[model samples]
Target: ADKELKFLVVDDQSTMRRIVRNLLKELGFNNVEEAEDGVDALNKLQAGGYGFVISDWKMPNMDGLELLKTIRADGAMSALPVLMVTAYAKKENIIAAAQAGASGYVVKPFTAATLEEKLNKIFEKLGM
Candidate 1:
């Protein structure tokens, strides 16, 4: 994966956003940005240049699932990688995300290694 790949971390919770950003930084991804929710995420994404998205499922205004669906529908970033990092650990939730075209899914309470592994899997699958 490219070390310079730009990442958007979206979460309504400030602490979770910081945590994801720090984890990404530790993974050697320095070009990272944060968004408060799906609407904010879309706003930043409209500026372009983002290569990946790590988003929480439950958010105000718009949720991660809706965001994923929107991204998949948009022609410009339809194929962009979206990793769902949420506390929704239900089998149905995973199935829904998979059906909605998430590049990867990680449940909450995940370790750094878990995040790394899921990211690598997505990178490999996408040939990035």
Candidate 2:
């Protein structure tokens, strides 16, 4: 079980934040937290113990791609799993996130099943 693993959901919209949190809870992950934007997410990362991050592409303060790059550059959380969850489904967007060291990418309006599948894939890649 992933009860001990912390998941951070980052999005500017409170609705999307809750949606992701609810989906994670449904997936049997009770240890999840929310961040209003990339900056807040990074702050929480600094506070420590986050195993996975699900972030939206657009937001105020900082965007998800920037956060992904920051995570990769940071020595301590460089290998932390980051999954980009965005409404921008363009090939360029996906490629950009991939190049920035994201563990996975999921287009917005995704189904709960897709989220779970992607999460599992990330877990497998990180050997979590």
Candidate 3:
């Protein structure tokens, strides 16, 4: 993985954002930013240089699924990888995410190893 790869961690909860940021730093990713929701994430993304996105499913303004779809539809960021880190474990939710072009799906309360594995998987799939 590229150490310079910029990451956006999107979650409505500050605690969860801190947790994800810490985990990303532990994984040797220091160029990370936080967003309160999908709308905020998109705002930052539009500023450019965001290589990856890890977003929570439930958010105040916009949800992860909607964010993923928006990214996928946008010409500039359509190929950008989006990994969903959500509490939703329902089959339908997963299906919807996958169909919407989520790069990966991770359930909540996952371990550091799980995040690492999923990140690696997406990187490999995209040859990034």
Candidate 4:
């Protein structure tokens, strides 16, 4: 299942993107791609081989929350799992993301273990 799962990692920072990509690789997800922001993410979404999205909250040309909304608006991609990647862990922000249709959320400056935990929850919910 891990092999079959493809993830789209979106962030404005190349450093953060590579860090996340390395972490995902360590977690056994080799089928991963990258995007610079929500707009770039949306473009990649139509490339047709992703099961999950891990996206930074703040970015130019659109943010994570907007990305979630964009996904929800497209029936073809609405079911794609999206995990908000942000530095904010406030209860209010979590609630906002949840309400906006993110499948999960993660605070930045986190470890591979934390990413794994969040990913496990999404997999469980999606019956992966």
In candidate 2, which residue ranges exceed 4 Å CA deviation? none
Per-residue lDDT of model 3, residues 34-114, tens digit only: 999989999999999999999999998998899999999999999998999999999999999999999999999899899
Best by lDDT: 1
For candidate 1, the per-residue lDDT at 105 reads: 97
Residue 96 displacement in candidate 2 (angstroms): 0.6
Instruction: Assess each prediction's global lDDT (C-alpha) against the native.
Output: 0.96, 0.90, 0.95, 0.89
What's the TM-score of every candidate structure? 0.98, 0.96, 0.98, 0.94
Clashes of 3: 0
Error of 1 at 78 (Å): 0.3
Candidate 1 total steric clashes: 0
Choose 1 or 2, whichever is better by lDDT.
1
What's the CA error at residue 4 for candidate 3, in Å? 0.6
lDDT of 4 by residue, 10-41 (tens): 99999999999999888788899999999899
Model 3 misplacement above 4 A = none
Model 4 residue 60 CA deviation in Å: 0.2
